[PDB]
Structure 1
Amino acid sequence: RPYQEKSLSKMFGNGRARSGIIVLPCGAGKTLVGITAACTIKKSVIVLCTSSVSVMQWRQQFLXXXXXXXXXXXXXXXXXXXXXXXXXXLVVSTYSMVANXXXXXXXXXXXXXXXXXXXWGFIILDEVHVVPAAMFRRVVSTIAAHAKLGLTATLVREDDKIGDLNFLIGPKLYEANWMELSQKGHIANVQCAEVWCPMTAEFYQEYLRETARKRMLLYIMNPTKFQACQFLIQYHERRGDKIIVFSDNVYALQEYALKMGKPFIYGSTPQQERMNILQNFQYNDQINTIFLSKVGDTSIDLPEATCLIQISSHYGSRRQEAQRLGRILRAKRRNDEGFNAFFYSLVSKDTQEMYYSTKRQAFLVDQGYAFKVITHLHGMENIPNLAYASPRERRELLQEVLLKNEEA
C-alpha cells in the first residue's frame, strides 16, 4: 500500500533517533509497517497489544516475514512464556500482565525478564488513544529504547489527555485522510443518517419525570421506535443486506432481540452460544439481523452487513461509539461498485440522547464522512407487522416501562 510507504518515508529520512504516531485504518495493513520497520532497525521489538487475538494476528505477520517459532520471536503471555534473542526479537505482550499490580501467576517475572536485560530497541503500541489513561504511564516509564512508534486508527477523545502523547511517545507524523483512502480501496462508502422517529405523549411526560441512567429506559423503549426498528429490519431484507444492530445498554439489547426473534450477544454470555450465532451469521442466510452489545464489537468486527442500525446510545462515549462504528466500516472492504454502507440512528424527538447523538455525528464530519437527515421513509405507514403501533400496545408498553422504572 502506498500510504504505508508514505508512513515509511519518514523512517528512511533521518534513520536514527525518531519517535512518532502513525494513523492508519484498521482495514489497512497497519501490521505490515511494523514488519518493515523491524527489518530496517533489526532490534528486539516488543509489541504492546491488549487481547490474545491481537497476539495471534501479529504472529501471522511474523510467519509472512521471517521466522516466529524459533528462539527469537517470543510470545509474552500469562499462561506461557517464550524465549527471545539479542537484537532480533519480536515479542508480543499484554497490558494486564506487564503493568498489573500484585496479581502474579508465575509470569510477571518473565514479563520483567525482557525489560531488565536491555532487550529493547523499538516500541510499538497498539491503539494509542487508550494510552490516555493511568496504567499506560507505568508501561512507558519502565522501558527505554532507541526509537518508538504508535499505531492507531482513531484518537478523538474528550478526556483531554490525547495531547499528552506528543512528549510521552511522540507527536503525530502522518494522518491519512479516510475519504481519500476510500478512493484507493473502497472501504464501504458511509451514509450517516438519523431516523427522526416521533415520541408518544405517554412516554414524553414520563421521560421528563425520570433522570440519571433510569431515563434512558423510556427513550429506547419508545413505541414508535419499535415501529422504526421493525420497518428498517424488513427493509434491509428486501435488498438482501445483513443488519448489525448496536446498543450500548445490555437490557435494551435483549428487549429488541427477543421481540424481533433474533439471537443476541450480550454481557456474560457463554462462548459456546456466542460462536454458534457467528456460524449462523457467516454461513446461514436466515440470520441477517444480529444484536450485539459491547463485547461483539471490540473483539471481532464483521466485514459483511452493509446496513448498520444504532438504537441504544450512551452520553459521553459518543467518541467511543465513533471508534466502534469506524472499525466496522474499515472491516467492510472488497471494493464494490455501490458499497453503500447505510448507518441509521433511531433518535426520538425532544430526548436527551438525540442532542448527544449530534456530537457523535459531528465527529464523522471531522473524518470526512457525509451526514444526512431522514425524518421518515415513505413506507413505514404500509407495514402491518410494526409492534406497538396500536394504542392498546402503546399502553401495554407504557405499563412495562413503568414497571421497569419501579425496579431500577
Structure 2
Amino acid sequence: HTSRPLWVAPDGHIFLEAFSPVYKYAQDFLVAIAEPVCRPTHVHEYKLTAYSLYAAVSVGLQTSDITEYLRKLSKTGVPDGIMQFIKLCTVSYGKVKLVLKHNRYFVESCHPDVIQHLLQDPVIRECRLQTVSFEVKQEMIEELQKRCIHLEYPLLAEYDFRNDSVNPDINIDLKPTAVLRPYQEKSLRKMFGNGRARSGVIVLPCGAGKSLVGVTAACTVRKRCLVLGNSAVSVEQWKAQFKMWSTIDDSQICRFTSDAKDKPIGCSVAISTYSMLGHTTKRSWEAERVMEWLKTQEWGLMILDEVHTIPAKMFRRVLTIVQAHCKLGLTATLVREDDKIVDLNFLIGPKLYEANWMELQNNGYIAKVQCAEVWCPMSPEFYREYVAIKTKKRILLYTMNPNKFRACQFLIKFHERRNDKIIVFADNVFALKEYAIRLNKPYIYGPTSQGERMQILQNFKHNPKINTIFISKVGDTSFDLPEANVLIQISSHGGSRRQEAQRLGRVLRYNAFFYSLVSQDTQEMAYSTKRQRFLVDQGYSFKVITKLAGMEEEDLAFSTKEEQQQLLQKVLAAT
C-alpha cells in the first residue's frame, strides 16, 4: 500500500511515481499500455485510451496479462470501470482484417457472424466491389477505417513480411557502423512485435535519431520502401541518410523532386515529397509517367516524415493514391491545432512509441536546454497607439517595440562575446528587415533564392566571423540548419505550439539555451503561454527574465527619444 506506484483513476488516468524502486519495470509497462500526457521529474501521468489498448494487444500481451499486472501495480485496486473498459477494448481486436493481394484491397474476417453484422451499415455497403471476405474499393479506404472504429471492430495493418512470396526482396542491409541507441531499439521492438511489421507513429526528437529508425525499419522489412518528406530539401537528406547507413548503390536511391529525376521509374527506394504525389493540377509529362508507375506497384513500409501535416485536405489524399502494406510515421512534434491528431489514429495507425524528453536529456543524447522568456516593457510612445486601434496594425506595434530591440541587441552581444552561434527567428518580415539592417547581420528573407540561401547558411557554420542570422518562417521544418547554440525568437506566429517545439529542435541538435522575446502588457503575453503549453509537458522549465544583466550600460541602440519617435513614424505609416 506504500509500494506499487500507480493510481488508476475511475475514468482513466494513471499517475506514476517516478521515484519508486520499481519505476523502470512500471514505466516499461505503461508505455506498452497507455499514452503519456505529462512527464515532469517526479510524478508522471499517463492515460488509458481506446487506441492505446489496440497497440497493447498487437504486441504479445493478452487481455489477462494487462488486467493481472494492473492489480500488482495498483495502490488502490482497479475500480471496476477500468476492468470493464480493458475487457471491452481488447476482446474485439483480431476480428476484421484489411489485407491486400495483387493490388486489390480485401476486408477479411474469420468469425462469420461479424460479416453478418458488418454488412448492414449503410456506408460499408457503399465501398464494396472459415474465411469470409468481400472486396472493398481503394478510393474510399479512408471512410471504411472511420466506420470500422465507429462500431468498435477496428482495422489492423499488420504486414506479415517474413513470408509473402509476391514481392522481390531487395538487397537493403544495415551496415555495421550505424549503432542504434537503447531508446531507438525500444521503439523498433514495439513496431516489429511478433515478427510482423505494424503501421504506427513513432515520435522521437529531431536531433535524436528520428531518421536512423526510418532507415533501420526499411532495413528490416526489406521490401520496396517509399520515403515522403515535406520539402525538396528533406528529400535531399533522406538520400544522404540512406547512403550513410544502408549500403545502397546510386542506381536504386531515386528521387522524385522535379529537378534531377535520377530515373525514378523502376527502383527500390523512392524519396519524394507531398504535393508531388498529391499534386491536384495537370502534371508534367515526365511526372505523369512515374505516377502511372507508382500507382500500380504495391509497396511495403511507406515512411511519412512530418506526420503532423498529413491530416490536411491535400496531404491525406496521398494515402489512397499509393498502396502500401505497412505505413510508418516519423515526426518530432505530434501536437497541432484544429484537433486533427485523433484523426491520424486511423490514417496511419496507433501511437507506437514516444520518447521521454527529459530522459534523453539526462543521458546526454539531447542538449540540456535552459528555456527563458525575457519580457520587455512597452515604450510609452508605442502604447499610445496600441490601445487606440484593434484592427491588425497592433501586430506590427508589439513586434517593432523599441524596448524589445534593446533586448535582442544585448542578447546578441552577450553571446558573441562567448563565441556562441545565434539564430534570430522572426516572422512578420517587415520586422525582419528593420532588425537585421540596424545591426548589419545577414537574413534569409524567404523570397531570397536557392543560391544565396545556401551561402549564408554555410558561412554561418564554418566561419567564426559571421555569428548571427535572421531567418523568417523558413526553419519551421526539418531543414539543414547548422547546429545553433542559442536562439532568440522574436514575435513568431500566433498561438501554435507546433512551431515553438520546432524552434526548440534547432537548439538541441547549460550547454545550449534559447530565448523568447515578449513585449509585455500586450496580446503576445497570452500567445507565449499558449506555446509553452506543449513544452511544459516534456519537463521544460521556462524562466522569466524581467531585467537583464546590465542592459543600460552598453552601447544599445534607440537610446534617446528623437530616434525612438522616427520608428513610430515608420511603423504606423504602413497601414
* TM-score, scaled to structure 2: 0.65
The 5-angstrom pairing of residues 246-285 of structure 1 reads: 246-285=425-464
Residues 236-286 of structure 1: per-residue CA shift (max 9 Å, x gap): 122222211111111101111011111111121133433332343223322
Matches within 5 A, 1:44-63: 44-63=224-243
| Native 8 Å contact 2:295 2:323 kept in 1 | no
Matched, 1:69 2:240: no
Picking from 84, 88, 92, the partner of 2:271 is 92
- 2:550 counterpart residue number: 379
| Whole-Å separation in 1 of the counterparts to 2:296 and 2:484 | 48
- Tell me the CA shift for residue 296 of structure 1: 4.6
* Contact 2:199/2:349, CA 8 A, preserved across alignment: yes
Q: Percent identity?
A: 61
Question: Which SS does the other structure have where 1:174 is aligned?
Answer: strand
How far is 1:104 from its partner?
A: 0.9
Inter-partner Cα distance in structure 2 for 1:31 and 1:238: 35
- 8 Å CA contact 2:376, 2:519 repeated in 1: yes
Counterpart of 2:214, as a letter, is: G
Q: 2:504 aligns with which of 326, 334, 342?
A: 326
1:10 and 1:402 map into 2 onto residues whose CA distance is 56
SS of the residue 2:285 aligns to: coil
Q: Which residue of 1 aligns with 2:297?
A: 118
Shift of 1:136: 1.8
TM-aligned CA deviation for residue 128 of structure 1: 0.7
Residue by residue, what CA displacement relative to the aligned partner does 1:123-159 show, whole Å, maximum 9, x if unpaired?
Answer: 2111111112011221111233222211111111122
Distance of 1:265 and 1:182 partners within structure 2: 30
Which residue of structure 2 aligns with residue 82 of structure 1?
264
Measured against aligned partners, the alpha-carbon deviations of 1:85-121 in whole angstroms (never above 9, x if no partner) come to: 5xxx211122122111123112332332343333312
CA distance in 1, matches of 2:301, 2:466: 45
Q: How do 1:94-173 and structure 2 match up within 5 A?
A: 94-173=273-352
**1:299: Cα distance to partner?**
6.3
**Structure 2 match to 1:309:** 488
Quote the Cα distance in structure 1 between the aligned partners of 2:203 and 2:294: 27
> 1:97–1:111: 8 Å Cα contact kept in structure 2?
no
Counterpart Cα distance in 2 of 1:239 and 1:156: 35
1:26-37 equivalences in 2 (<5 Å): 26-37=206-217
Match of 2:518 among 347, 351, 354: 347
Aligned 8 A contact 1:30 1:151 in 2: yes
Work out which of the residue numbers 193, 196, 203 in structure 2 matches 1:13. Answer: 193
The separation in 2 between residues aligned to 1:115 and 1:386, in whole angstroms, is 59
2:165 is matched with: none
Residue type matched to 1:142 in 2?
Answer: I
Q: Is residue 310–residue 345 contact of structure 1 (8 Å, CA) maintained in 2? A: yes
Structure showing greater radius of gyration is 2
CA contact 2:475–2:481 (8 Å) conserved in 1: no
* Residue pair 1:78, 1:105 contacting (<8 A) in 2 also: no
For residue 283 of structure 1, give the secondary structure of its aligned residue in structure 2: coil
Alpha-carbon shift at residue 6 of structure 1 (Å):
0.6
Task: Look up the match of 1:370.
Answer: 541
Query: Which of 193, 207, 218 lines up with 2:397 in the alignment?
Result: 218
CA distance in 2, matches of 1:37, 1:378: 49
Contact residue 21 and residue 172 of structure 1 kept, 8 A: yes
**Closer/same/farther in 2, CA of residues 117 and 271 from structure 1, 3 Å limit:** closer
Q: Secondary structure at the match of 2:424?
A: strand
Equivalent AA in structure 2 for residue 78 of structure 1: S
Q: Which runs of 5+ in 2 are unaligned?
A: 1-180
The secondary structure found in structure 1 opposite 2:423 is strand
2:550 is equivalent to residue 394 of structure 1: no
Alignment check: 8 A CA contact 1:48 1:125 kept = yes
Residue 38 (str. 1) matches residue 218 (str. 2): yes
- Per-residue CA deviation, residues 210-240 of structure 1 (Å, 9 max, x unaligned), is 3343211111222211222222122112222
The one-letter code matched in structure 2 to 1:248 is D
Q: How do 1:190-209 residues align onto structure 2 when only pairs under 5 Å count?
A: 190-209=369-388
What is the RMSD of the two structures over their aligned residues, measured on CA atoms?
A: 2.1
Q: Is the contact made by 2:275 and 2:314 (CA closer than 8 Å) also made in structure 1?
A: no
Question: What TM-score comes out, normalization by structure 1 length?
Answer: 0.89
Look up the match of 1:335: none
Quick one: which of 413, 423, 429 aligns to 1:244? 423
- Could you tell me which runs of 5 or more consecutive residues in structure 1 were left unpaired when the two chains were aligned: 332-337
More helix per residue: 1 or 2?
Answer: 1
1:324–1:11 distance in 2 versus 1, CA, 3 Å: closer
